[PDB]
Design a protein around this ligand. Structure first.
Ligand code: CA
Lengths: 9, 223
C-alpha cells in the first residue's frame, strides 16, 4: 500500500 | 509495524495470528473461546494461532485452533471500513497460561494522549516490504478526534480513532490488521487502515472498540 488508503490486512 | 521494536518473548499473551496457509491478520483473545479481529480480515477458512512469538518456528508454546464461528459486524462497510470488527469463536477452548492470556474489554473510551501498545507481524518497511518472524511492538498515543479528521478529511466516522504520530515514521502496516491496540491493559482499538504506512500527517486509523462492548457481549452470549 503506497500513497493511497488501504486496509492493513 | 514500522519503526517499532521486537516485543519481549510472550509479553503480549493476548495476541493471535490468523492463518490460512500463512499469517494474514492479527487478532486478540478476549476470553477462552473468542477472538476479536478486523472484519476486512474475513475468510471462510481460518486457523487461529495462539502463544506465538516467532511465527516461522515452532517454539513449543503454540496452540493452533480452527475457527468455528466467524461473525463480522452486521453493519460492516467494505468501502469505508466503518464497523471494521469481527468475532471468532474457537472450535475448542484455549488453554490459558503464562504465554496465552486474555485482554480486557474497555470500561470506557480512551482519552487523547493515552499511550497504548500496538503489535503485529506486519510489514516493517514504509517503502517496499519486509515481514518479520518475531512479533513487533509499538507504543503510541491516542490522537484527538480533531487531529484524526484533519488528517483524513470526510473519512473518519464516530467508530474510528487515530493512534500514532503526525510526524510519521512509526505506525502499523499491512499484515497488522485485526491486531490489538491496548491502553492500560484494555483493548481500545483494532488495526484497520491508513494512507500508506508511517507517512507524515497520516497516522493509523483504528476501530474504536469501546463503541462495541454491548455488541460483543451480546454476540458471545447468543452464540
Ligand atoms: Ca512459533
Amino acid at each position: 500500500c503506497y500513497f493511497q488508503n488501504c486496509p492493513r490486512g | 509495524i514500522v519503526g517499532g521494536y521486537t516485543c519481549a518473548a510472550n509479553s503480549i499473551p493476548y495476541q493471535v495470528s490468523l492463518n490460512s496457509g500463512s499469517h494474514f491478520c492479527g487478532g486478540s483473545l478476549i476470553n477462552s473461546q473468542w477472538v476479536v479481529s478486523a472484519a476486512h480480515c474475513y475468510k471462510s477458512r481460518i486457523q487461529v494461532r495462539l502463544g506465538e512469538h516467532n511465527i516461522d518456528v515452532l517454539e513449543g508454546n503454540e496452540q493452533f485452533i480452527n475457527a468455528a464461528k466467524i461473525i463480522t459486524h452486521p453493519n460492516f462497510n467494505g468501502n469505508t471500513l466503518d464497523n471494521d470488527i469481527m468475532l471468532i469463536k474457537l472450535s475448542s477452548p484455549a488453554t490459558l497460561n503464562s504465554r496465552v492470556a486474555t485482554v480486557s474489554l474497555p470500561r470506557s473510551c480512551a482519552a487523547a494522549g493515552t499511550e497504548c501498545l500496538i503489535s503485529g507481524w506486519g510489514n516493517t518497511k514504509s517503502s517496499g516490504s519486509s515481514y518479520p518472524s518475531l512479533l513487533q511492538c509499538l507504543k503510541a498515543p491516542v490522537l484527538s478526534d480533531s487531529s484524526c479528521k484533519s488528517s483524513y478529511p470526510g473519512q473518519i466516522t464516530g467508530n474510528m480513532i487515530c493512534v500514532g504520530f503526525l510526524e510519521g515514521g512509526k505506525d502499523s502496516c499491512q499484515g497488522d490488521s485485526g491486531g490489538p491496540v491496548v491502553c492500560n491493559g484494555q483493548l481500545q482499538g483494532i488495526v484497520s487502515w491508513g494512507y500508506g504506512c508511517a507517512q507524515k500527517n497520516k497516522p493509523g486509523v483504528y476501530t474504536k472498540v469501546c463503541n462495541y462492548v454491548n455488541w460483543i457481549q451480546q454476540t458471545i452470549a447468543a452464540n
